[PDB]
Amino acid sequence: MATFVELSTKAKMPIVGLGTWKSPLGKVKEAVKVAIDAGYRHIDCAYVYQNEHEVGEAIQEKIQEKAVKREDLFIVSKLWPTFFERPLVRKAFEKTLKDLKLSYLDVYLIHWPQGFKSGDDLFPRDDKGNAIGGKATFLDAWEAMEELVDEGLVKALGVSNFSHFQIEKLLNKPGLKYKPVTNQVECHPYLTQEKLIQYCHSKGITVTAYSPLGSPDRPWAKPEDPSLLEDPKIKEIAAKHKKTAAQVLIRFHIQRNVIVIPKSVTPARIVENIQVFDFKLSDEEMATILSFNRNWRACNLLQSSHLEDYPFNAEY
Ligand SMILES: NC(=O)c1ccc[n+]([C@@H]2O[C@H](COP(=O)([O-])OP(=O)(O)OC[C@H]3O[C@@H](n4cnc5c(N)ncnc54)[C@H](OP(=O)(O)O)[C@@H]3O)[C@@H](O)[C@H]2O)c1
Numbered sequence: 172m173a174t175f176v177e178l179s180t181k182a183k184m185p186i187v188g189l190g191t192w193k194s195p196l197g198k199v200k201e202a203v204k205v206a207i208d209a210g211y212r213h214i215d216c217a218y219v220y221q222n223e224h225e226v227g228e229a230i231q232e233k234i235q236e237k238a239v240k241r242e243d244l245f246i247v248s249k250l251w252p253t254f255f256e257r258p259l260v261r262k263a264f265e266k267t268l269k270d271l272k273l274s275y276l277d278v279y280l281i282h283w284p285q286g287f288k289s290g291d292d293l294f295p296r297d298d299k300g301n302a303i304g305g306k307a308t309f310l311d312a313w314e315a316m317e318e319l320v321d322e323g324l325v326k327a328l329g330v331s332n333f334s335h336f337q338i339e340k341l342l343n344k345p346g347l348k349y350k351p352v353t354n355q356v357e358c359h360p361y362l363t364q365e366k367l368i369q370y371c372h373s374k375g376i377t378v379t380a381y382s383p384l385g386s387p388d389r390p391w392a393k394p395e396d397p398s399l400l401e402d403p404k405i406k407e408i409a410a411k412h413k414k415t416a417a418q419v420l421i422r423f424h425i426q427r428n429v430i431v432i433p434k435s436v437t438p439a440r441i442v443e444n445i446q447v448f449d450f451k452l453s454d455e456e457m458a459t460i461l462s463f464n465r466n467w468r469a470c471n472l473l474q475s476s477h478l479e480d481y482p483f484n485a486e487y
């Protein structure tokens with residue numbers, strides 16, 4: 172059972188959540204059930220993962236079996252950037268909500284700040300694989316999502332993969348109704364996001380750390396990529412506490428008051444990943460881990476660098 176980070180809406184976001192990207196059908200259902208049994212209440216989902224219907228089945232089971240109540244679950248999903256045009260925001264959301272079998276979402280995120288060609292081709296690309304842009308912007312999408320909050324279909328809005336420039340663009344938009352409660356970004360010891368975390372916290376925006384384990388299974392992974400789990404310096408700190416490298420990697424975020432969403436479909440690892448509240452990384456250990464910062468992204472999305480609101484060009 173996790174502690175919480177309080178949002179600006181006063182809602183309580185569990186500090187450890189279950190990731191579901193690449194969780195296969197036929198395993199994600201059992202994964203969600205095992206997580207809930209283990210005390211997970213926060214589940215991180217997305218339209219683009221195309222598995223929300225099976226996550227929904229699992230949540231529903233556990234609710235109808237009285238394992239958990241809905242008010243105690245914290246469900247997050249994301250709007251894919253082929254759906255920034257106003258009517259499409261609603262249709263995509265309704266599909267997400269229907270798949271999850273829920274009456275509301277706790278948080279709804281803009282998945283990426285750059286708009287892609289609108290429609291149900293989720294990855295419009297040219298011959299060379301480069302993303303094809305759409306003219307609708309994240310501010311267009313935001314306007315549409317604010318309706319969902321008005322209607323109570325979504326308790327809070329948030330963003331993902333935003334730089335501080337794009338968050339400023341959002342916060343400084345004349346006539347804003349709702350503020351983002353979180354910015355979900357890649358974060359781990361090779362990409363410590365010190366500047367972006369400092370910025371977000373100063374604006375009352377929490378940070379959710381994705382790929383906390385280095386996303387070691389990701390398709391675009393080349394052999395020369397750094398491995399956090401196998402990192403001797405990470406393993407050293409784990410050994411000190413008789414814990415795993417993964418437990419250290421997760422606890423690292425908890426101690427910066429950053430929400431973290433490790434993905435697994437393996438019951439043993441699902442349980443392991445939330446056994447992070449019976450030990451404490453020392454100030455020196457935290458300092459050591461921070462020093463590992465390489466500004467290395469596992470998720471670069473370079474195929475879209477040519478579009479307007481590419482977030483990773485800026486320093487933070
Ligand atoms: N907003 C975005 O753009 C975005 C981008 C990426 C991810 N996310 C979210 O963040 C979540 C986490 O990121 P991620 O899935 O990219 O990678 P991650 O959580 O860093 O790593 C997941 C991988 O690590 C393995 N693993 C899990 N626990 C382990 C443990 N204790 N020991 C060893 N290996 C372990 C998993 O294997 P098994 O699953 O086979 O156990 C899986 O292959 C995603 O599922 C998704 O919900 C969001």
Ligand SMILES: O=C(O)COc1cc(Cl)ccc1C(=O)NCc1ccc(Br)cc1F
Pocket residue numbers: 192193217219220221287293294295296301302303472474
């Ligand atoms: O958000 C995540 O969890 C990781 O991101 C993805 C997830 C899924 Cl299920 C699928 C794809 C991505 C993902 O980010 N894929 C890379 C990619 C390639 C081409 C184009 Br036009 C866009 C694009 F984002």
